[PDB]
Amino acid sequence: MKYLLARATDEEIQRKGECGGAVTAIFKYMLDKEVVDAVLTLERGYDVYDGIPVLLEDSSGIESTCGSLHCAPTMFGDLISRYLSDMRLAVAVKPCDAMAIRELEKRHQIDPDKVYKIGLNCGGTLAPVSAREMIETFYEIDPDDVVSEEIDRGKFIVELRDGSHREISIDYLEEEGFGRRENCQRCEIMVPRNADLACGNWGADDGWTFIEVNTERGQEIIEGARSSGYIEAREPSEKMVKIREKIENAMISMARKFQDKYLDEEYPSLDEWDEYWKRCINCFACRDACPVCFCRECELEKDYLLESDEKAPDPLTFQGVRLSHMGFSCINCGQCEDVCPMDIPIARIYHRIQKKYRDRTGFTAGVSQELPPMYSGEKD
Amino acid sequence: FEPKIVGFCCNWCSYGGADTAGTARMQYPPNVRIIRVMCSGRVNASMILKAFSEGADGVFVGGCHIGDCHYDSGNYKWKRRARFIEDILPEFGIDKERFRWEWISASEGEKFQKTMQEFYETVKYLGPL
Amino acid sequence: MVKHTLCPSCSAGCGVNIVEMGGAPVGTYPYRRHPVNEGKTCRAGRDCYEIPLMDRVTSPGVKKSGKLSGVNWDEALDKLTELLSSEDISILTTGTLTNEEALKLREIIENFNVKKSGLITVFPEFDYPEIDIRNIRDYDNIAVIGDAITCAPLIGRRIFHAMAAGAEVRSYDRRDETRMAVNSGFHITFSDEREVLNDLQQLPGGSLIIITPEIPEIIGPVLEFSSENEFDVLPIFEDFNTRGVMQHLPPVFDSVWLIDPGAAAEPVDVSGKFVLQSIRTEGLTPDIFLPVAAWCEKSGSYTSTAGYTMKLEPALQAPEGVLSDMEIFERILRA
Amino acid sequence: EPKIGVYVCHCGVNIGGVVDVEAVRDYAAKLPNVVIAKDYKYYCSDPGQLEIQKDIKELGINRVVVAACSPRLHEPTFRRCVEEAGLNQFLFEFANIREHDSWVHMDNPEGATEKAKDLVRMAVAKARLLEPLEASKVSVDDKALVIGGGVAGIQAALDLADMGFKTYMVEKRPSISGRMGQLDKTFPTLDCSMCILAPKMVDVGKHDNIELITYAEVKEVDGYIGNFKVKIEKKPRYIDEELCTGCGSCVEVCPIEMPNYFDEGIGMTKAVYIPFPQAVPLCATIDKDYCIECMLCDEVCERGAVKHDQEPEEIEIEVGTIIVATGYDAYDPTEKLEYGYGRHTNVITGLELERMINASGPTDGKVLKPSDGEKPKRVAFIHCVGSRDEQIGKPYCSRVCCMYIMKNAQLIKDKMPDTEVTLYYMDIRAFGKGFEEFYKRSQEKYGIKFIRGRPAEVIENPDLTLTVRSEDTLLGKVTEYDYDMVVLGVGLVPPEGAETLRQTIGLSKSADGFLMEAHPKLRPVDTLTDGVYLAGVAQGPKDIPDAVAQASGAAARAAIPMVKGEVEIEPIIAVTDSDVCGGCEVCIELCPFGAISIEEGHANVNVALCKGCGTCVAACPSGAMDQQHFKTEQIMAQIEAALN
Ligand SMILES: Cc1cc2nc3c(=O)[nH]c(=O)nc-3n(C[C@H](O)[C@H](O)[C@H](O)COP(=O)(O)OP(=O)(O)OC[C@H]3O[C@@H](n4cnc5c(N)ncnc54)[C@H](O)[C@@H]3O)c2cc1C
Ligand SMILES: Cc1cc2nc3c(=O)[nH]c(=O)nc-3n(C[C@H](O)[C@H](O)[C@H](O)COP(=O)(O)OP(=O)(O)OC[C@H]3O[C@@H](n4cnc5c(N)ncnc54)[C@H](O)[C@@H]3O)c2cc1C
Ligand code: SF4
Ligand code: SF4
Ligand code: SF4
Ligand code: SF4
Ligand code: SF4
Ligand code: SF4
Ligand code: SF4
Ligand code: SF4
Ligand code: SF4
Ligand code: SF4
Ligand code: SF4
Ligand code: FES
């Protein structure tokens, strides 16, 4: 079974689920049947803009984790490698989460045996505060009234407390400096085929989740969840499986256009990069947030590299060194740019360097299961 | 303008090549300073970036010819790193002409002398970094 | 596991998530939803999770001969009541209590008659405006006294935003090589406060004066100048809840009761008895120690320099044997 | 705290002529941690060495910097000088101011002097951070293991045993001999092959320095050179090797018929069998895939050597060197569907023909048609079956098929003068000694016909004759000739279980699928895995004399370390900090000598296997790996000194 249409058998889960609640039903089955010891997911805080990671040990009250949070640009790989390493686990992953976990698994920081990946289709995420400012400026509503959010026919659309829907073309918002994160606009991966399962709504009807099973482990998950009646499944029309392929191809083409824009046409000049690098406060937030920078002790803090004075570091010994260390394994997750207190576009340069390396060698960070050719023991 | 050039030369061939050039009394500009390593596989991007950040106008790396490595594969790893470094360097305003990596054998004194002369001329033409 | 809280390492109201495993803090996670920083933090904000575990003392202590020795809560409370009620005490606090705790301590002070009281701060009592830092970019002219970028990096971020949007930024300091001096549009190194005042003479109305504690002598005049010439003043206080504590207590020795649940007190001069109510006692040798709960182990509200108030629930469980400052205060009052 | 003494050598007028040695010494005197800075005319001499030794002894110097000529010329000299002075030889640094400065900048005395000052500064910067290192000594056990009991393995074992080294030979088959014992005659001399091989097999079987373990396989190999621990699984013969005499009574009374592995699928034997009369050891073996436990062998055996209750045995040996001599398998042409091997009755391979022509083979030396058991009147031979063919991924030449095809054609003509033999070839590779004369004699003496053309197809006729559809490229025309028998010149492939053994030992294979040598030209029998050597066809296809030469060479190379009894390793090796190592393992595959392993989630460098290149050190991101005498801090200090 390559493709399925699944939805939860519990009425509460399907009601609260974004797309029929199949993902929540899989997690509930996995915890209830003890396939895994825990589930790492998101859970909204005091509003839709506040998604906090949660590690559930049992399925009691799991429906609180239902729904999609487009304003939660979270990374799970770093949490799975820092603290959850010796646990059997099931985690909801966007394609960037799966890419980070794959890059960490090929470096033996995460055990692929112990981690189950129910990946989600991702068309992009938004920064919460920026999203609220956008809703105030363009939707002319109080952001606290928004109860849900989705992107679709090119449209950010918001469900409301009243019950209506407000729609704005995402092209307009992204041309006005808003909308999805800039790294999300360049994202070339939409279905997480580097995960065990790939669940989305691009080939599904209302109330159903379109699932692509990528691995035999995904097949075991789906079989165990259907046999016990946690999930009910049907098979997409192959007219649907083609609409999904076309949508994905269009999205990837738009991503390539945005790469040509941000990394070639609107790429800052050397003078603009000098202006940016003058700002750096040497806080190492980019290094800490980067999932691929996992080392117990970092070379950038050695006496012969670290900037001693309270001034901007030399861009070479900080940025160029981190680039030489991991820029072939950059997954364009944007976390480094997200956390930078100085608003430096780090991800642009790191993604451009990774793209040059990929064009030369053909290595895709976060997708290929092997190490980069840099670490090849052959004499290729 | 006298450029400052830092060189890394493997013990077995490229250091031997510079020694051969010296024994034959082949003259090249005094700008280069050579640091000795056992293999070019010892060199990484950190060394090159440090040299450029400490004030080097050009950086030279000299290894054994592909297939001649005294440790049988070190220059392959170095070549990979050198290509990636060529990718990285222009992103920070360093012309990749300032970074020269060559294969020199222990008997190629003339090759070493010519490489040093041309690298010095190139870096001098480029000007201060 | 992952719980919201406020970074206590400076006055900027940055939010951070503390990751908890097994009942102890193990790391930090971005708090993107917070409007002050949006999940961005300096190095100090990403190391704060270690504060509850660094040299933590969870047993009330008393000065036996020479060294401190453990005792129970009732004895220490009674012997503090002794000094409070009979001989004399000066109560000093840092900007590290909650607003409710500040109100309770103000009640304690007036009732037990403390002549000398207040908050340890170099800033005066001023009609400080509420200035949401998101609006700093809207100001046409900004003057900075001190190194605002280094004191609170996440407000220097907003200064950078303002410079991007055309705001003319001028910086004044005694030093010529500082991050603000380096990055501002124009910098003036001055040896006389008169030069700073003369330069501020040209600032149009509604301009923004961001003043740090680097130069304590010019704070008084500048505030005065800002009241005469109709400027908006953003102070950068020393402690995370200095502005919240300032409301209930005024800015302040023989015998001192020092309350600093955040351990943010630069050493002060004590001649007589020393009653320390903090989380760690490494620096000094107090006569009696009152271990309290940390910033993140309390229920209550904090106000940042800009004025952003934030109500907080306990992100961590207070260690057994310690009490929140308000419990100690209520015991002192009721006992 | 470092206390550095700097010594500038004039070299007569070679350095002092261009470089102002006095100014360089003065500059060196001021550098931090430099206590004394002298200069002498010839520091490579007893006077200069005595001056250096005297200052070491008198001024309490712990670091020495000589500014002179190449480390490559006189580093051992000054290392010996300082060590005799009592100072560790790795607390000495060299600055090259003659080949790198004074002989190449004769036109710029000022530039030469400034460059000399810079180089001395770099040398002092490195010296300040040097540490004392001691060379390590690794004991080498004087016992060897030879895997494979063919002609190459037999030769290697005999050579090692005759040099006095106790040897263990391990052979998976019940008897030693390999493929050479299966041949009837050898090219280019047509000499009886078993009659030259059998004496060597008997020698191996009763040699005092050889322990022969037949019918056993190498299960595990751990350790390194001189320190190999090998676990061997001796499969149950169900016959007592000590009591059995090989009389063969048990074989006669066995009611079960089983294929004989020695006959390559055209001869049969019983479930209890002796592979051939000249087997070493001459012992019986029972195969339990065919035994019915009738017990007839038990009541007929006169020595009580039948043991149906036998169990597999485990042998643990400790050796110093391993020689892999595992040989080859014949290519299986069943996949070449156009030639119809396995479908057409009268299509056979070259090895089957070797067994058929053999006078002790299943047919008693008579070449007969498998269909009707009659002598073929017409025989065709096809070259390059399974070789030089990219449709099957075998783009190499097996190097022996031409010669054995011609040998078998000559043997057929000798046995059957009136038979007609034709060979279909692309190239005739008669390259060895006497091979070209063999080629000519195939035509002049025996009248064998040679057609240049790779046959397109072999078609079976209803009467079971075979039509070979092939172009005669020299006549330039398609030919369809009929034959009573077609023989396929199958190539050489690595044997079954080659990959298992290769992973067990940790060796690397070449493109053609065979084991890889350390250097193609100058180290044909060595491997990058210290203490392991290759002999014979294990390294790649070749004929008997080449395999014998390789086996003797492998014996010599293995004996050298065992003769020495120890190996000295220079301490410029890599070292891992387990506190910083994240266990990412990206360094493991970068060592060409396999010196790095992972224990307890951290990288460990084997001291005996590290050559000190520094590739793993440069690859480690976090810096948990560092090279002694070339630490990252030292090189960074040198860079800073060179530029500042
Ligand atoms: C930011 C985002 C963008 C998406 N974009 C697309 C898209 O373009 N096209 C498409 O077809 N599908 C997209 N999806 C998936 C879509 O919501 C599917 O309908 C759904 O994933 C199918 O599973 P479900 O509805 O049964 O899951 P549910 O029962 O709703 O469970 C979803 C689970 O995902 C977890 N999760 C993991 N990461 C996040 C996160 N960042 N935010 C919120 N929840 C998270 C939730 O906590 C919850 O446990 C997106 C999802 C997210 C979170
Ligand atoms: C049809 C044919 C005809 C030939 N005719 C001639 C000729 O006339 N003249 C000539 O000079 N050459 C000839 N050759 C080539 C010749 O056979 C080889 O050069 C020679 O046999 C190689 O000997 P070896 O010891 O390297 O390998 P092999 O003869 O293959 O012996 C290898 C030994 O290792 C054993 N072994 C394999 N794997 C293991 C294992 N895992 N553990 C333990 N033991 C193992 C095998 O069972 C065998 O005992 C011919 C080859 C063929 C195919
Ligand atoms: S980077 Fe790609 S996978 Fe990650 S949130 Fe953005 S669009 Fe989704
Ligand atoms: S460099 Fe930035 S974009 Fe690339 S993987 Fe690291 S955090 Fe993500
Ligand atoms: S910068 Fe280099 S050493 Fe530091 S964490 Fe990243 S990869 Fe590791
Ligand atoms: S996060 Fe930004 S300011 Fe901090 S070290 Fe990285 S680039 Fe510099
Ligand atoms: S700017 Fe201040 S409040 Fe914000 S993270 Fe840094 S130290 Fe903490
Ligand atoms: S040490 Fe070198 S330069 Fe000095 S005298 Fe000897 S050979 Fe000549
Ligand atoms: S016991 Fe087995 S081997 Fe012996 S005679 Fe019977 S069938 Fe043959
Ligand atoms: S088992 Fe006995 S009967 Fe059989 S061959 Fe050996 S000695 Fe002869
Ligand atoms: S030796 Fe002759 S028959 Fe064998 S592969 Fe080479 S060319 Fe073909
Ligand atoms: S030594 Fe370095 S590269 Fe090797 S496993 Fe340890 S951390 Fe990884
Ligand atoms: S330094 Fe070279 S030889 Fe030594 S372990 Fe590392 S890669 Fe192997
Ligand atoms: S030894 Fe010079 S490159 Fe390896």
Deposited experimental method? cryo-EM
Strand residue runs (E) in chain B: 5-10, 32-37, 58-63, 99-103
SS3 content of chain B, % helix, strand, coil (to 5): 50, 20, 35
DSSP label at A145? G
Exposure class string for A265-278: b at 16+ Cβ within 10 A, else e:
eeeeeeeebeebbe
**Residues in CB range of D86: below 8 A, 6 or more apart:** D56, D57
CA of D617 to the centre of ligand 5 (A): 14
Contact yes or no for A346/A283 (Cβ under 8 A): no
Q: Torsions phi, psi of D52, nearest 5?
A: -65, -45
Interface of A with C (CB under 8 A): 45, 47, 49-50, 52-55, 72-73, 79, 82-83, 127-130, 278-279, 281, 283-285, 288-289, 310-312, 338-343
Q: Which of D217, D192, D199 minimizes the C-alpha distance to D151?
A: D199
DSSP label at B15? H
Helix axes C325-334, C99-111, angle to 10 degrees: 20
**Alpha-carbon distance A353 to nearest alpha carbon in chain D (angstroms):** 18
Task: Write down the residue that tokens 């030489």 correspond to.
Answer: A324
* Dihedral sign from CA coordinates of B110, B116, B119, B124: negative
In chain D, count H helices and then E strands: 15, 34
Q: Which of D460, D349, D339, D466 minimizes the C-alpha distance to D391?
A: D339
Does B69 show up as a binding residue in the annotation?
Answer: yes
**Cβ-based burial of C258 (10 A; exposed 0-12, middle 13-18, buried ≥19):** buried
Contact yes or no for D580/B59 (Cβ under 8 A): no
Contact yes or no for C231/C203 (Cβ under 8 A): yes
Measure CB to CB from residue A373 to each of B80, B87, B88 and give the nearest one: B80
Q: Torsions phi, psi of A216, nearest 5?
A: -60, -35
Q: Containing H/E element for D626? A: strand D625-627
Q: Give the number of other CB atoms < 10 A from CB of residue D99.
A: 26
The strand pair at D420-425 and D378-385 is best described as parallel
**Residues in CB range of D66: below 8 A, 6 or more apart:** D7, D9, D43, D52, D78, D92, D93, D94, D95
DSSP label at A314? P
Q: Torsions phi, psi of C86, nearest 5?
A: -115, -60
Token pair for D289: 């895939």
- Pocket probe mutation, ligand 3, options A125, A251, A258, A354, max atoms within 8 Å of Cβ: A125
Torsion of CA D600, D603, D607, D609, to 10 degrees: 110
- The rounded distance, in Å, linking the Cα atoms of D426 and D423 is 10
Q: Containing H/E element for D174? A: none
Contact yes or no for D66/D38 (Cβ under 8 A): no
DSSP label at A371? P
Task: Write down the residue that tokens 């090692």 correspond to.
Answer: D160
**Alpha-carbon distance D524 to nearest alpha carbon in chain A (angstroms):** 19
Q: What is the resolution of this structure in A?
A: 2.4
Give the atom of ligand 11 at the shortest distance from the alpha carbon of D396: 5
**Lateral strand order in the sheet of B32-37:** B32-37, B5-10, B58-63, B99-103
Exposure class string for D314-347: b at 16+ Cβ within 10 A, else e:
ebebebbbbbbbbbbbbbebeebeebbbeebebb
Breaks (C–N over 2.5 Å) after residues, chain D: none
Token pair for A210: 């379109």
Tell me which of C17, C28, C40 to substitute to probe the interface with A (most A C-beta atoms closer than 10 Å): C40
Contact yes or no for D326/D147 (Cβ under 8 A): yes
Q: Torsions phi, psi of D434, nearest 5?
A: 80, 5
**Residues in CB range of D2: below 8 A, 6 or more apart:** D33, D62, D63, D127, D128
Token pair for C127: 């009609």
Q: Containing H/E element for D547? A: helix D544-564
**Residues in CB range of D462: below 8 A, 6 or more apart:** none
Q: Torsions phi, psi of C287, nearest 5?
A: -60, -45
Chain D residues touching residue B30 (CB < 8 angstroms): 101, 105, 108, 111-112, 114-115
The strand pair at D143-147 and D321-324 is best described as parallel
The strand pair at B58-63 and B99-103 is best described as parallel
For residue D639, give the 3-state DSSP assignment. Answer: helix
**Alpha-carbon distance D395 to nearest alpha carbon in chain A (angstroms):** 19
User: Would you give the distance in Å from CA D500 to the centre of its chain?
Assistant: 16
Token pair for D247: 């009389």
- The rounded distance, in Å, linking the Cα atoms of D287 and D261 is 11
Q: Give the number of other CB atoms < 10 A from CB of residue D511.
A: 8
Q: First and final CA of chain D: distance in angstroms?
A: 23
DSSP label at D432? S
Cross-strand bridge partners of residue D604: D597
- The rounded distance, in Å, linking the Cα atoms of A76 and A98 is 9
* Dihedral sign from CA coordinates of D354, D355, D360, D364: negative
**Cβ-based burial of A349 (10 A; exposed 0-12, middle 13-18, buried ≥19):** buried
**Residues in CB range of A309: below 8 A, 6 or more apart:** none
Write down which chains contact chain B via at least 3 CB pairs under 8 A: A, D
Contact yes or no for A133/A122 (Cβ under 8 A): no
The strand pair at D574-576 and D625-627 is best described as antiparallel
Contact yes or no for D39/D9 (Cβ under 8 A): yes
Q: Which residue of B has its CA nearest to A358?
A: B84
User: Would you give the distance in Å from CA D610 to the centre of its chain?
Assistant: 19
Token pair for D604: 């460990």
- The rounded distance, in Å, linking the Cα atoms of D231 and D217 is 9
Is the C-beta atom of A344 inside 6 A of ligand 6? yes
Q: Which of D563, D578, D573 minimizes the C-alpha distance to D613?
A: D573
In order of C146, C148, C175, C189, the CA distances from C178 in angstroms are 9, 10, 7, 11
Contact yes or no for C47/C278 (Cβ under 8 A): no
Does D159 show up as a binding residue in the annotation?
Answer: yes
The strand pair at B58-63 and D257-259 is best described as unpaired
Contact yes or no for D387/D331 (Cβ under 8 A): yes
User: Would you give the distance in Å from CA A218 to the centre of its chain?
Assistant: 19
DSSP label at D587? T
Kindly tell me whether chain A and chain D come into contact, counting contact as 3+ Cβ pairs under 8 Å: yes
Q: Which residue of B has its CA nearest to D105?
A: B27
Torsion of CA D268, D273, D279, D283, to 10 degrees: 180
Residues composing chain A: 380
In one-letter notation, the amino acid at residue A112 is P
Q: Which of C172, C160, C280, C268 minimizes the C-alpha distance to C222?
A: C172
C-alpha count within 13 angstroms, C-beta hemisphere, residue D566 = 6
User: Would you give the distance in Å from CA C209 to the centre of its chain?
Assistant: 20
Q: Which of D337, D421, D332, D426 minimizes the C-alpha distance to D375?
A: D421
User: Would you give the distance in Å from CA C67 to the centre of its chain?
Assistant: 30
Give the atom of ligand 13 at the shortest distance from the alpha carbon of D606: 5
Which long-range contacts does C132-137 make (Cβ < 8 Å, 24+ apart)?
Answer: C132/C306, C132/C307, C132/C308, C133/C36, C133/C158, C133/C234, C133/C306, C134/C35, C134/C158, C136/C161, C136/C162, C136/C208, C136/C234, C137/C161, C137/C162, C137/C164, C137/C165, C137/C167
Token pair for D332: 């299986």
CA of D600 to the centre of ligand 12 (A): 13
Breaks (C–N over 2.5 Å) after residues, chain C: 252
- The rounded distance, in Å, linking the Cα atoms of D349 and D323 is 30
Contact yes or no for C190/C146 (Cβ under 8 A): no
- The rounded distance, in Å, linking the Cα atoms of D104 and B27 is 4
- The rounded distance, in Å, linking the Cα atoms of C233 and C226 is 7
DSSP label at D516? P
DSSP label at D518? S
For residue C231, give the 3-state DSSP assignment. Answer: coil
Task: Write down the residue that tokens 């003068």 correspond to.
Answer: D417
Contact yes or no for A197/A90 (Cβ under 8 A): no
Strand residue runs (E) in D80-130: 92-96
Dump the DSSP string for C117-150. EEE--SS---------GGGGGG-SEEEEES-HHH
Q: Containing H/E element for C273? A: none
C-alpha count within 13 angstroms, C-beta hemisphere, residue C183 = 30
**Residues in CB range of D30: below 8 A, 6 or more apart:** none
Contact yes or no for D314/D232 (Cβ under 8 A): yes
- The rounded distance, in Å, linking the Cα atoms of C103 and C97 is 10
Kindly tell me whether chain D and chain C come into contact, counting contact as 3+ Cβ pairs under 8 Å: no
DSSP label at B6? E
Contact yes or no for D470/D454 (Cβ under 8 A): yes
- The rounded distance, in Å, linking the Cα atoms of D495 and D86 is 57
Cα–Cα–Cα angle for D397, D402, D406, nearest 5°?
170
Contact yes or no for C206/C231 (Cβ under 8 A): yes
3-state secondary structure D48-92: HHHHHHHHHHHHCCCEEEEEECCHHHHHHHHHHHHHHCCCCHHHE
**Alpha-carbon distance D389 to nearest alpha carbon in chain A (angstroms):** 24
